[PDB]
Write a protein that binds this ligand. Sequence first.
Ligand code: THP
Ligand code: CA
Length: 129
Amino acid sequence: LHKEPATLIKAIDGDTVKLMYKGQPMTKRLLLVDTPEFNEKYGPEASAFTKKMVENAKKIEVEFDKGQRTDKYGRGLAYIYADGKMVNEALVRQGLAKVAYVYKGNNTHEQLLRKAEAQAKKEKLNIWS
Ligand SMILES: Cc1cn([C@H]2C[C@H](OP(=O)(O)O)[C@@H](COP(=O)(O)O)O2)c(=O)[nH]c1=O
Ligand SMILES: [Ca+2]
């Protein structure tokens, strides 16, 4: 996989962000994770965590997996990096997202994320508390 440049347009919620990618505005949905909706428990914390991560970043990168790059809603499916740190993994490590939506073909970082989820659950963090 390769990292490609993008710039933040707007934080949306815990697992979606609006970025400018190849010069077009696009809503990116984070691969392999599920954050609670803003209206559910830890939803506001997940949105806040992602917002901080992307808004503080000096460099945001998008990394597509091997499979489909857009979902049925037209959202980009990607791993997103903020100054080299993966947002998807960070949310999971903090117990603010579950590993989820693991489809054959877009799952290169599954093991990495499940490893994070295990540590988060061990520490009884947030969703696991
Ligand atoms: C993460 C991801 C979600 N999706 C679709 C599945 C779900 O369809 P449904 O909307 O019919 O349930 C939806 C969940 O996204 P959200 O968690 O943002 O609601 O996004 C994909 O198709 N591929 C993916 O990799
Ligand atoms: Ca969600």
